[PDB]
Structure 1
Amino acid sequence: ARGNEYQPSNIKRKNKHGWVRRLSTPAGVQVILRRMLKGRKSLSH
């Protein structure tokens, strides 16, 4: 019954975790800054 909580959709993915949404708020900008500081290959989703 459970386990399939991920029902993928690229529209939702980009609108929820994308670069534009991350930059849309100061908190998300700090998210990107933390990922850059850590050296993440993928900064946003």
Structure 2
Amino acid sequence: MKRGMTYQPSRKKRINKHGMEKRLGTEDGRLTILRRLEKGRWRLTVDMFR
């Protein structure tokens, strides 16, 4: 069968799996945020907007 369609977008799934509230809920996620602050990435999470 044709492959290459492994991404099926879903807004609710994206926020629950990779959101800021999720990253701040565990020690390992908090360490991930610090690593991205140290490298100086402009956007920290897929969930961020102004």
TM-score computed with the length of structure 1 as normaliser: 0.90
Across the aligned residues of Structure 1 and Structure 2, the Cα RMSD in angstroms comes to 0.7
Aligned length: 45
Structure 1: runs of 5+ lacking an equivalent: none
Partner of 1:43: 44
Which ranges of 4 or more aligned residues in structure 1 deviate by more than 4 Å? Answer: none
Q: Which has the higher helix share?
A: 1
Structure 2: runs of 5+ lacking an equivalent: none
Instruction: Say whether 1:31 aligns with 2:45.
Output: no
TM-score computed with the length of structure 2 as normaliser: 0.82
